[PDB]
Amino acid sequence: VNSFSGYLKLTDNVYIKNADIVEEAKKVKPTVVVNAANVYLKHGGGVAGALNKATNNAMQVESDDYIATNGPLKVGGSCVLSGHNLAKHCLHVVGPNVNKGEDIQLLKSAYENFNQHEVLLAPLLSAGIFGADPIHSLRVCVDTVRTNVYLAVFDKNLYDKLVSSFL
Numbered sequence: 001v002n003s004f005s006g007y008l009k010l011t012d013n014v015y016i017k018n019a020d021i022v023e024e025a026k027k028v029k030p031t032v033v034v035n036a037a038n039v040y041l042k043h044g045g046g047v048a049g050a051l052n053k054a055t056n057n058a059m060q061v062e063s064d065d066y067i068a069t070n071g072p073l074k075v076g077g078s079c080v081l082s083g084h085n086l087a088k089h090c091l092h093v094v095g096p097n098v099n100k101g102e103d104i105q106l107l108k109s110a111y112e113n114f115n116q117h118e119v120l121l122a123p124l125l126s127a128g129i130f131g132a133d134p135i136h137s138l139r140v141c142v143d144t145v146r147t148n149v150y151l152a153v154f155d156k157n158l159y160d161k162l163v164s165s166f167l
């Protein structure tokens, strides 16, 4: 049993809810929250910008030190950093950004990072300002992630379309 409430069950291991991920993290304090990161961990807007704002910029400060030591992530890659006030850990995952011309086949590699964690609160990778089709992102998630994933969808309209169209 876990703390997640109000989710629709899509499969054995994938759950979905219309919820503001910043507000969901604050309520649940999950072991892992996933950030929709870029390779520079520059959390300016989107999921990254919203989560970073909720940490009072502490996520960005920590991220800048990580990049100064390690250099940029790979598209499809990830790193584990602090969850600050939102979670124990934040898994920063880089899905491909279609608005930069990145290979959408890298979306499966991105979701494979989730399999290193037994339970996660996450957004749909490469959705929103990363430009991918969220219906596609949900299909790749279901077909790739084997651990227990609780997906948060900000847009009520999109949430209802993801559920109604789910095979």
Ligand SMILES: Nc1nc2c(Cl)cccc2s1
Pocket: 019, 020, 021, 022, 023, 045, 046, 047, 049, 050, 128, 154
């Ligand atoms: N507070 C929140 N901001 C966002 C943004 Cl900017 C994108 C996607 C989901 C959420 S939840």
